[PDB]
CSV table of C-alpha atoms (C1' of nucleotides) and ligand atoms in Angstrom, one decimal:
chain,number,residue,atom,x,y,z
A,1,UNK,CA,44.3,-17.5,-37.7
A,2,UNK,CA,44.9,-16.2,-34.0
A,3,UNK,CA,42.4,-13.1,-34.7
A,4,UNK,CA,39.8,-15.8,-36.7
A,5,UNK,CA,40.2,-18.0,-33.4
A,6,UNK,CA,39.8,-15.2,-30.9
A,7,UNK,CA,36.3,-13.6,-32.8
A,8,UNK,CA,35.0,-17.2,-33.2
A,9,UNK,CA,35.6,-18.0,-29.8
A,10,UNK,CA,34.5,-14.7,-28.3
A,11,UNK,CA,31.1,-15.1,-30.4
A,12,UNK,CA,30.2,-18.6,-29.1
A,13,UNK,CA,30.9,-17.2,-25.6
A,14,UNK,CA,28.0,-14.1,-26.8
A,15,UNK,CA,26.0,-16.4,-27.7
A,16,UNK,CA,26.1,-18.6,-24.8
A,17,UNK,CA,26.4,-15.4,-22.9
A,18,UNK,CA,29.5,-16.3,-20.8
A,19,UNK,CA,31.2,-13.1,-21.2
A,20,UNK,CA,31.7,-9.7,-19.5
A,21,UNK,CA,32.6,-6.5,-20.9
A,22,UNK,CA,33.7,-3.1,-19.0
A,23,UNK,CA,36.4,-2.7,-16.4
A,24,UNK,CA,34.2,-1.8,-13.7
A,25,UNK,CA,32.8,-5.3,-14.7
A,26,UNK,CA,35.6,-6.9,-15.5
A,27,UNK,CA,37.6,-6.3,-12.0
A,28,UNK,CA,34.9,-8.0,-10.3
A,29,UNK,CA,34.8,-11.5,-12.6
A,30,UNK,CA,38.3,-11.3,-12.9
A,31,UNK,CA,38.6,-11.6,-9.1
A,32,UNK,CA,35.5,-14.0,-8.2
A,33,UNK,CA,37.9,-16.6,-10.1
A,34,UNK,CA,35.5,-17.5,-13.0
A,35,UNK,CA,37.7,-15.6,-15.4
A,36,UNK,CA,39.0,-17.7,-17.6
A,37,UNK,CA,40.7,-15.1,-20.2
A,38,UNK,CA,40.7,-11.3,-20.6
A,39,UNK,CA,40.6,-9.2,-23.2
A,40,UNK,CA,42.3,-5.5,-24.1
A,41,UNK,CA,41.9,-3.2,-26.6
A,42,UNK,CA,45.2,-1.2,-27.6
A,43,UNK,CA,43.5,2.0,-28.3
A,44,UNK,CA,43.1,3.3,-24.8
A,45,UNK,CA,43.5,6.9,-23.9
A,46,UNK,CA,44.2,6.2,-20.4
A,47,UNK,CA,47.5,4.9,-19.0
A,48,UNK,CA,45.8,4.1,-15.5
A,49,UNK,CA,43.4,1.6,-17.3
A,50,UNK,CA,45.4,-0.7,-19.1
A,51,UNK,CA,48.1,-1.0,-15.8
A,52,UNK,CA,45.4,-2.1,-13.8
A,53,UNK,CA,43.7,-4.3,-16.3
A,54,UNK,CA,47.2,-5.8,-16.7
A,55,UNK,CA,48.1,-5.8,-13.3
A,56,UNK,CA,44.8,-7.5,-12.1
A,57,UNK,CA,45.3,-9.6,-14.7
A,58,UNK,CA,48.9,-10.9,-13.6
A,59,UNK,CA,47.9,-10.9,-10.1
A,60,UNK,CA,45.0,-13.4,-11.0
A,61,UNK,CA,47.0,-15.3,-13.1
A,62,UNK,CA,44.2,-15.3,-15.9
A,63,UNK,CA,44.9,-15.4,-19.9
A,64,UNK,CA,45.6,-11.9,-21.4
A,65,UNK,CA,45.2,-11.2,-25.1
A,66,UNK,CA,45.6,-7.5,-26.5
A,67,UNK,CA,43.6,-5.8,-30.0
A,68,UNK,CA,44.7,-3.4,-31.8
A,69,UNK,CA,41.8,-1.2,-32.0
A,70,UNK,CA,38.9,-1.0,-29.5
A,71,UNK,CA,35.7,-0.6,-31.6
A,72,UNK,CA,36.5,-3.7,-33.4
A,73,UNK,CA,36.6,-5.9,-29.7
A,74,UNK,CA,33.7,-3.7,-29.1
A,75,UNK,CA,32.1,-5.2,-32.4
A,76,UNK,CA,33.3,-8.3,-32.0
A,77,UNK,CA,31.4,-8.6,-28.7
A,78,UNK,CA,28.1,-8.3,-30.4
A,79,UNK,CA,27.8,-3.9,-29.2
A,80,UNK,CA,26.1,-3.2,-32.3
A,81,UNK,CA,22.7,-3.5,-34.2
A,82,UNK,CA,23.0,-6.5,-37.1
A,83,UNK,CA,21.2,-4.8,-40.1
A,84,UNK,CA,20.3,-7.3,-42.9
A,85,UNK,CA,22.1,-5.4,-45.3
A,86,UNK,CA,25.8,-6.2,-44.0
A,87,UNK,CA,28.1,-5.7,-41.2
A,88,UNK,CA,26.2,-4.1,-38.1
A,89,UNK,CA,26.2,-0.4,-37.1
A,90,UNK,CA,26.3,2.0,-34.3
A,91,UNK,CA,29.4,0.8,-32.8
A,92,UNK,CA,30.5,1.7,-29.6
A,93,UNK,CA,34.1,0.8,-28.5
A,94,UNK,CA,34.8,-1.6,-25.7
A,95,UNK,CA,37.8,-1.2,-23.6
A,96,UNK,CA,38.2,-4.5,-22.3
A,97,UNK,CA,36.2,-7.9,-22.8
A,98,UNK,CA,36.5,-10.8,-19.8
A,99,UNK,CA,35.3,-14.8,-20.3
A,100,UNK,CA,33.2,-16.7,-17.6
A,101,UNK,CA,33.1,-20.1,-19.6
A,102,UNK,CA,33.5,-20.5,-23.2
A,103,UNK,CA,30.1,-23.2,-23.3
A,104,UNK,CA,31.4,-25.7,-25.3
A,105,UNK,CA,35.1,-26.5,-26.9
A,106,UNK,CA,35.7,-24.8,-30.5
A,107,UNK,CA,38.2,-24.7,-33.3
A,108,UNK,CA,39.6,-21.6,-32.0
A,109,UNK,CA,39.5,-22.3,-28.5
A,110,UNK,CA,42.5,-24.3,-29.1
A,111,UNK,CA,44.4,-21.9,-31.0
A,112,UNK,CA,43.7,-19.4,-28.5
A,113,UNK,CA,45.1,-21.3,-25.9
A,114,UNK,CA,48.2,-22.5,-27.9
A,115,UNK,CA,49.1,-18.5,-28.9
A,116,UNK,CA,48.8,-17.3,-25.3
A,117,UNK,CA,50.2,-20.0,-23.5
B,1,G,C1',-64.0,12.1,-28.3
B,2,G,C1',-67.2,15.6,-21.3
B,3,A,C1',-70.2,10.0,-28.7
B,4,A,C1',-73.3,5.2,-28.8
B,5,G,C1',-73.5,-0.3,-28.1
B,6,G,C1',-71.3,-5.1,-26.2
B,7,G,C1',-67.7,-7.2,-22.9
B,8,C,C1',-63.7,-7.2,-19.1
B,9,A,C1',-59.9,-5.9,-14.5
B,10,C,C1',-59.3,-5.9,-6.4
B,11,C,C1',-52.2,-2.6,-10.5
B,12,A,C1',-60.9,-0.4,-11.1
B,13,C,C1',-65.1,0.1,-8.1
B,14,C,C1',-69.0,-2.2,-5.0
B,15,A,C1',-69.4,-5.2,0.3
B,16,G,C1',-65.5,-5.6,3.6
B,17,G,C1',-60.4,-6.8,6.2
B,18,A,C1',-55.6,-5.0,7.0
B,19,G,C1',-54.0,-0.6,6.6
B,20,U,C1',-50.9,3.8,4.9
B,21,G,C1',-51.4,9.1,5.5
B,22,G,C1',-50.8,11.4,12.3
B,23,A,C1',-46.2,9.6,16.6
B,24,G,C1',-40.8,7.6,17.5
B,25,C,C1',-37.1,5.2,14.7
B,26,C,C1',-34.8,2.5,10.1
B,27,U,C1',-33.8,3.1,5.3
B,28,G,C1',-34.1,5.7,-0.2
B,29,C,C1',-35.0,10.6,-2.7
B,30,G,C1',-34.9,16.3,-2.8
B,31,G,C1',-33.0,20.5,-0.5
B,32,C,C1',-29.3,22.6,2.5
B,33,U,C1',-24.3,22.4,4.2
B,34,U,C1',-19.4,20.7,2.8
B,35,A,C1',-12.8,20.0,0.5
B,36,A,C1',-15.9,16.2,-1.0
B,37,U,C1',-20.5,15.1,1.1
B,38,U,C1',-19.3,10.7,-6.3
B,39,U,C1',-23.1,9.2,-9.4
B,40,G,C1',-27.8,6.7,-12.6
B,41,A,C1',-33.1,6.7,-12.2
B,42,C,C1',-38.3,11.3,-11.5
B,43,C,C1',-48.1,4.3,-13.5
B,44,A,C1',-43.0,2.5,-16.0
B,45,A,C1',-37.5,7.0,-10.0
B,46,C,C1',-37.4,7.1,-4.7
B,47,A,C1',-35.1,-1.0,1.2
B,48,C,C1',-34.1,0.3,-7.1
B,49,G,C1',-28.8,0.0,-9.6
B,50,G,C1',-29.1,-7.1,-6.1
B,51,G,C1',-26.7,0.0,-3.7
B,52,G,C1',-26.9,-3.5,4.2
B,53,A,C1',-19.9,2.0,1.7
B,54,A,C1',-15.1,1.8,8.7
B,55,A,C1',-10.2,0.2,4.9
B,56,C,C1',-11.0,-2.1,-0.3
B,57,U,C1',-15.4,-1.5,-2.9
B,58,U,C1',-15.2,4.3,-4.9
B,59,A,C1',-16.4,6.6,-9.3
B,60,C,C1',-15.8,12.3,-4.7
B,61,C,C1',-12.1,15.3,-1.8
B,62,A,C1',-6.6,16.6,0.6
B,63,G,C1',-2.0,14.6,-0.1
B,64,G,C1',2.5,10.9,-1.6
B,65,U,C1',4.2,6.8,-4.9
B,66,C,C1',4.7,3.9,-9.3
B,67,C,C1',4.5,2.5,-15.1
B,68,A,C1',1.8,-2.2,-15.3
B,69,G,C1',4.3,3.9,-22.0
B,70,A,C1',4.3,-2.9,-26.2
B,71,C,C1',6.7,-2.2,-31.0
B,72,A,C1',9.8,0.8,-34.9
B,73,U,C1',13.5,4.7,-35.9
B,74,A,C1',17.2,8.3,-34.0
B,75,G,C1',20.3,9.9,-29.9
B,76,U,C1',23.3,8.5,-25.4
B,77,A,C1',26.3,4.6,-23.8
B,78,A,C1',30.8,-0.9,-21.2
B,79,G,C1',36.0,5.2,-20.6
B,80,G,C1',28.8,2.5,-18.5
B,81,A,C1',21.9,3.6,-21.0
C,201,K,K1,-51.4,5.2,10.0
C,202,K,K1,-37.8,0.0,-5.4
C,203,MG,MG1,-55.3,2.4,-7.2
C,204,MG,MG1,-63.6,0.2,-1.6
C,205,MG,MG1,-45.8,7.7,9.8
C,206,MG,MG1,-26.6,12.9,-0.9
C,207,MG,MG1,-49.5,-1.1,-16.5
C,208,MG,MG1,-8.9,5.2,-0.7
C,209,MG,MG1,-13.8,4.4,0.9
RNA sequence: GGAAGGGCACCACCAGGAGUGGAGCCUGCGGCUUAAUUUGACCAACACGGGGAAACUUACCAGGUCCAGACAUAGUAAGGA
């Protein structure tokens, strides 16, 4: 239920648009203090990125959750076009995903905090 | 109709007034010139387009910006369009 939690919560936050994506993004609300979790996909090619995503992360003392594969946290933070037929295409993979404010409490919000706590 | 008859009009005349046409200047038109000298109009065009334009107006000419190209599909793209 930790993965149904996490895409729940990070689709209320999309939809209430509280939500960054991108390092070069991400650094910057991690370190104004408004980030209240971060996000990282596993499938990185690059070594540098995920130290400093986790070292930022330590350093600001903000919630860090890992994914197994980046297009799927890409998905899940709405980077595609919904068709009506099913599950939305052109994908493109997101590296990391940051949370500004959730907008209102959630099922998952909880279990989320429970898992990485 | 350089045919006849009847009638009528100071955008016709008669009887007259002011005149205009001549001079200087203002303003519109043609022509010429010009990078352009934007252009419509030739009784019923020509101080007309309410048109007396320094910018704007502006339509012309010599240059420099910008999109104020919705929406749909495809591509690129958060390792950033
Ligand atoms: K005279
Ligand atoms: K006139
Ligand atoms: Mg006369
Ligand atoms: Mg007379
Ligand atoms: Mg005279
Ligand atoms: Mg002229
Ligand atoms: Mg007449
Ligand atoms: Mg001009
Ligand atoms: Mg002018």
């Amino acid at each position: 239920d930790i993965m149904t939690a996490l895409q729940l919560v990070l689709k209320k936050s999309k939809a209430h648009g509280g939500l960054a994506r991108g390092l070069h993004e991400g650094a910057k609300v991690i370190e104004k203090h408004a980030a209240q979790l971060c996000v990282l996909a596993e499938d990185c090619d690059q070594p540098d990125y995920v130290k400093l995503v986790k070292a930022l992360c330590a350093d600001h003392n903000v919630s860090l959750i890992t994914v197994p594969n980046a297009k799927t946290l890409g998905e899940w933070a709405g980077l595609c076009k919904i068709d009506s037929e099913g599950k939305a295409r052109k994908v493109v993979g997101c590296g990391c995903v940051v949370v500004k404010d959730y907008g209102e409490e959630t099922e998952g919000l909880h279990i989320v905090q429970e898992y990485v706590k």
